[PDB]
C-alpha cells in the first residue's frame, strides 16, 4: 500500500486551490477557493452569496476554510486524509497563530498523521533551483515581494500589495464595457478571464504602445464568445496588465510591482543585493503575462545603479511553482525529521 506513505501537498491560494500528491510533475487538482451559500463549493458555484476565505492571502473564515480543505481531500483528490501526510503552504507573513489553527484543524477534523507548514515564496525558489533571490508571487488577490537568502526569508523586506489577478479581470470588464460590450452575468466573468489570459500582454513602453493603437490595428486581436460573436480587443490588451505597474488605474495609491521590488531589495544588506538583483524569480499566475519580464528589467534598471546586472527569472511553469516546490520538499526522504507527529500535537498542543 503506502508504507512509504504517499504524501500530499496543498497550496492555500487566495483565488485558486492547487493540490496534489507529492512526487508529481504538477498538481492533479486545481479548483477555485470559494464557498457559496443560497453547501456550494468550487466552479460548481457560478442567486448566491459568495465569500472568499483567503481573499487577501491570509485566512479569516478559519473554520470555513475546513470545508475547502474537505472538498480538496475527499472530492477533488479522492483521498482519505487519515492515511496520507500533508504539506500546507502559508503566506509570507502568516500570523504565528494562523499556522497553529491550521496545525489543529488538520490533526482534528481529519486525523492527519503528520503535517508541515512552509512559506509559499520559499517553495518557489526551490523550483527555480536557487537559494538566494527575491520572489514576486502575483496571485489572484494578493502579491508579495519576499527576499530570500540562503534558504530563509528576510522579513525586514517582505512587502505586500493587494493588486492582483481578480482586480485586473474587473478592470478588463470596465474597459471592455467602455469598448461597448456588456458581460456581467457572473458566469461571463470567466469569459473575460479567458480574454485576459490569452490575448493580453505587458508593454515595454505604455505610452508608445498606446499611440500605435490609434494609428493602426496591429495590436488588435479577436475573441469568439460562446454565443459565436467575435469581439475585438485593442488597447485593452496592455492596459489590463499595466495596472500592476500603475496602481492608479483601478484607484489605488500604492506603488507598482516595479517599485515594491526596489524598495524590498534596498531594505536589505548592500552585499546580498547583487545576488538579489541577479535572481529576481517570478511566481504566480499573474506573472504569466507576455513581456512582464522585459518591463520589469527595464523599470528596475532605471531605479537601480548603472553597474547592477538585473536578471528577471521567469520559470516556464510558474503558475504552480509553489506546488512544485512542496512536491519536491515533501518527497524528500529527509522530511520525516521536520514532520510534526500526532503524538507531538497531543503532548505540546498545536505549538
Amino acid at each position: 500500500d503506502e508504507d512509504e506513505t504517499t504524501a500530499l501537498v496543498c497550496d492555500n491560494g487566495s483565488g485558486l486551490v492547487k493540490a496534489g500528491f507529492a512526487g508529481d510533475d504538477a498538481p492533479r487538482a486545481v479548483f477555485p477557493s470559494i464557498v457559496g451559500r443560497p453547501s456550494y463549493v468550487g466552479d460548481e458555484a457560478q442567486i448566491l452569496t459568495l465569500k472568499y476565505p483567503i481573499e487577501h492571502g491570509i485566512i479569516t473564515n478559519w473554520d470555513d476554510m475546513e470545508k475547502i480543505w474537505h472538498h480538496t481531500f475527499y472530492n477533488e483528490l479522492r483521498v482519505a486524509p487519515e492515511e496520507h501526510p500533508t504539506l500546507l503552504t502559508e503566506a509570507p507573513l502568516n500570523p504565528k497563530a494562523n499556522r497553529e489553527k491550521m496545525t489543529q484543524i488538520m490533526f482534528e477534523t481529519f486525523n492527519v498523521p503528520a503535517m508541515y507548514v512552509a512559506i509559499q515564496a520559499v517553495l518557489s525558489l526551490y523550483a527555480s533551483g536557487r537559494t538566494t533571490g527575491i520572489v514576486l508571487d502575483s496571485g489572484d488577490g494578493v502579491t508579495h515581494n519576499v527576499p530570500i537568502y540562503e534558504g530563509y526569508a528576510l522579513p525586514h523586506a517582505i512587502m505586500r500589495l493587494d493588486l492582483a489577478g481578480r482586480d485586473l479581470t474587473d478592470y478588463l470588464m470596465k474597459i471592455l464595457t467602455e469598448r461597448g460590450y456588456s458581460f456581467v452575468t457572473t458566469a461571463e466573468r470567466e469569459i473575460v478571464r479567458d480574454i485576459k489570459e490569452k490575448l493580453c500582454y505587458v508593454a515595454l513602453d505604455f505610452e508608445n504602445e498606446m499611440a500605435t493603437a490609434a494609428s493602426s490595428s496591429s495590436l488588435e486581436k479577436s475573441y469568439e464568445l460562446p454565443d459565436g460573436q467575435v469581439i475585438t480587443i485593442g488597447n485593452e490588451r496592455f492596459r489590463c496588465p499595466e495596472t500592476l505597474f500603475q496602481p492608479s488605474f483601478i484607484g489605488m495609491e500604492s506603488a507598482g510591482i516595479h517599485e515594491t521590488t526596489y524598495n524590498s531589495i534596498m531594505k536589505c544588506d548592500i552585499d546580498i543585493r547583487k545576488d538579489l538583483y541577479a535572481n529576481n524569480v517570478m511566481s504566480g499566475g499573474t506573472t504569466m503575462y507576455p513581456g512582464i519580464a522585459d518591463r520589469m528589467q527595464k523599470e528596475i534598471t532605471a531605479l537601480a545603479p548603472s553597474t547592477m546586472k538585473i536578471k528577471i527569472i521567469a520559470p516556464p511553469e510558474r503558475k504552480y511553482s509553489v506546488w512544485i516546490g512542496g512536491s519536491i520538499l515533501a518527497s524528500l526522504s529527509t522530511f520525516q525529521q521536520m514532520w510534526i507527529t500526532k503524538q507531538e500535537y497531543d503532548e505540546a498542543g498545536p505549538s
Binding site: 510533475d25 500605435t212 496591429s218 512544485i324 516546490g325 524528500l332 526522504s333
Partner: protein, 435 residues
C-alpha cells in the same frame, strides 16, 4: 584635444582548490555520496552538491556548491538547493552557497578538480521513474576544450562526425579501439587530457591528425559529414582574430550591445539577439522569442560594426542571419559544445536539412519614404491582417499601395489623401480595411 575622464570611469579563487571535496549527487529525491572513484565525473542530467571545506590562514570556512545539470529536472534542482541549506544549517550558517550551472562553472569550482572535469551526457530518472542512462557505453565520443587554463573539460557529444571541431580534440571509445582525433588548433593542455582519458583503455589509443583520418574511423562515427571546419577555428588564437559575441537587447529600455566573454551555448538567451564576429563571417542569431525591434536594430548595428572596424573592413564580409534551431556547424564552432536537444530536437544540421528542405534552412544574408520608395503590394495583400508580407509599415499601409489602384479604392491621389485631415485619414483607411 581632451580625454573624457569617463574613459577611466567606465573575484578570485579564495584558495588553491586543494581542500577536501564531498560530492553528493541527487538520486531518488535524496543525496547519495559519490564514490571517490567517480570524482571528476558529473552527469548533465543529474544535479550534484559539493561540500568544499578549507582553512586559509588557520581559518576554517565553508562553501557549498550545488551544480545543476542542463538537463536536470526541476525535482533534482530543488533537492540540490534544499540540501545545500541543510548542510549549511548543519554548519550553523557558516557556509556561503554558490549555484553552478553546466558550461558556466566558476574558476574556484574547476580548481577543485585540478581543471579536469568530465561531464557525461545522461543521468538518473527525474520525478522518480524510468530511463536511467547511467552508462556512457561501450561506444561514445568526448569533446576536450579549454577557453582559458584551469578549464579543460571533457563532455560527451553525439557520436557523429558533425560534432567534431577544429579548435579542440576528441576521444572516440569504440568496441574495436580508442582513437584520439587532433585538430589544427588543439592546445597541448587539451591534447594531454585526451591522452590521459584515453590511457584508461586497456587497449590503448591511436592518435589521428586532421586530414590523416583513416577510413576505419568514420565507419564508427557513422560516416563523414561537414564539421566545424572554419578558418578561424583551424588556426590558433595567437594569429586569428579572437572570436567575440555580443548581446543586443532593449530590455534595459535602451537598445544596447554587451560583450559576453568565454561565451558558450547557455549564454544565448532565446529572448534577445546576438552577433558573433569571426573575421571571415559575422553572424546574427535571431531568438525565436525575440522582438522585431531588437532584430532590426541588431541587423543594422551589425553593419556599423563592419564600418567602424579599426582594421581592414573587407566590405563584402558576409553578415549572415541565423535562426534558433537552424545553426550551421561553423556558427557552433566558436561556441564550445552545442546541444541539439535544446532547440533543434536532437537532429544534426544535416538531418535538419533533409526534413526542413535545405532551402528553408538557408541563411539569409543582410544586404518615412516617398511613394516610389515604398514596396507596392497588391490591395488583397494589404487588406489582410494574417501573416502578410513582412517589411510593411502596418501604421501606414496605404503607402504600400500603387498610385493607380489608390484612386480606385479611395477616390483620390495620395497627394490629396495626406492633405486631408488626420481624423479623415484614419476614418477613410478603416473604411477601406487599411488601418
Amino acid at each position: 584635444t581632451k580625454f573624457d575622464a569617463m574613459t577611466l570611469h567606465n573575484t578570485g579563487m579564495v584558495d588553491d582548490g586543494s581542500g577536501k571535496k564531498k560530492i553528493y549527487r541527487i538520486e531518488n529525491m535524496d543525496l547519495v555520496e559519490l564514490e571517490k572513484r567517480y570524482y571528476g565525473e558529473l552527469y548533465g542530467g543529474d544535479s550534484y552538491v559539493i561540500h568544499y571545506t578549507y582553512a586559509v590562514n588557520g581559518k576554517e570556512e565553508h562553501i557549498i556548491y550545488y551544480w545543476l545539470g542542463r538537463h536536470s529536472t526541476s525535482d533534482e534542482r530543488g533537492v540540490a538547493a534544499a540540501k545545500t541549506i541543510e548542510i549549511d544549517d548543519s554548519l550553523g550558517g557558516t557556509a556561503k552557497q554558490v549555484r553552478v550551472v553546466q558550461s558556466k562553472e566558476p574558476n574556484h569550482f574547476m580548481a577543485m578538480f585540478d581543471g579536469k572535469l568530465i561531464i557525461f551526457q545522461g543521468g538518473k530518472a527525474g520525478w522518480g521513474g524510468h530511463n536511467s542512462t547511467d552508462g556512457p557505453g561501450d561506444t561514445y565520443l568526448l569533446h576536450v576544450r579549454g577557453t582559458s587554463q584551469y578549464n579543460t573539460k571533457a563532455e560527451q557529444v553525439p557520436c557523429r562526425a558533425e560534432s567534431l571541431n577544429s579548435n579542440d580534440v576528441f576521444v572516440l571509445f569504440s568496441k574495436g579501439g580508442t582513437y584520439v582525433w587532433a585538430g589544427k588548433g588543439c592546445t597541448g593542455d587539451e591534447r594531454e587530457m585526451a591522452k590521459k582519458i584515453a590511457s584508461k583503455s586497456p587497449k590503448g589509443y591511436i592518435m589521428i591528425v586532421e586530414g590523416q583520418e583513416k577510413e576505419e574511423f568514420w565507419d564508427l562515427l557513422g560516416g563523414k559529414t561537414e564539421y566545424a571546419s572554419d578558418f578561424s577555428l583551424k588556426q590558433a588564437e595567437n594569429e586569428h582574430r579572437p572570436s567575440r559575441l555580443f548581446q543586443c537587447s532593449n530590455a534595459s529600455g535602451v537598445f544596447k550591445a554587451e560583450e559576453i566573454v568565454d561565451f558558450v551555448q547557455e549564454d544565448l538567451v532565446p529572448e534577445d539577439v546576438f552577433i558573433l564576429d569571426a573575421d571571415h563571417t559575422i553572424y546574427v542569431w535571431l531568438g525565436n522569442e525575440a522582438r522585431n525591434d531588437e532584430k532590426q536594430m541588431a541587423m543594422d548595428t551589425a553593419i556599423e560594426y563592419l564600418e567602424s572596424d579599426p582594421s581592414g573592413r573587407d566590405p563584402d564580409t558576409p553578415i549572415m542571419t541565423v535562426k534558433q534551431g537552424y545553426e550551421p556547424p561553423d556558427f557552433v564552432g566558436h561556441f564550445g559544445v552545442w546541444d541539439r536537444q535544446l532547440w533543434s530536437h536532437g537532429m544534426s544540421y544535416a538531418e535538419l536539412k533533409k526534413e526542413l528542405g535545405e532551402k528553408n534552412m538557408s541563411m539569409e544574408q543582410v544586404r518615412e519614404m516617398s511613394f516610389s520608395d515604398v514596396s507596392k503590394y497588391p490591395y488583397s495583400v494589404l487588406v489582410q491582417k494574417e501573416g502578410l508580407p513582412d517589411g510593411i509599415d502596418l501604421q501606414n499601409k496605404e503607402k504600400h499601395l500603387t498610385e493607380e489602384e489608390f484612386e480606385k479604392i479611395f477616390g483620390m491621389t495620395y497627394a490629396t489623401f495626406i492633405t486631408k485631415p488626420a481624423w479623415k485619414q484614419t476614418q477613410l483607411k478603416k473604411d477601406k480595411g487599411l488601418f
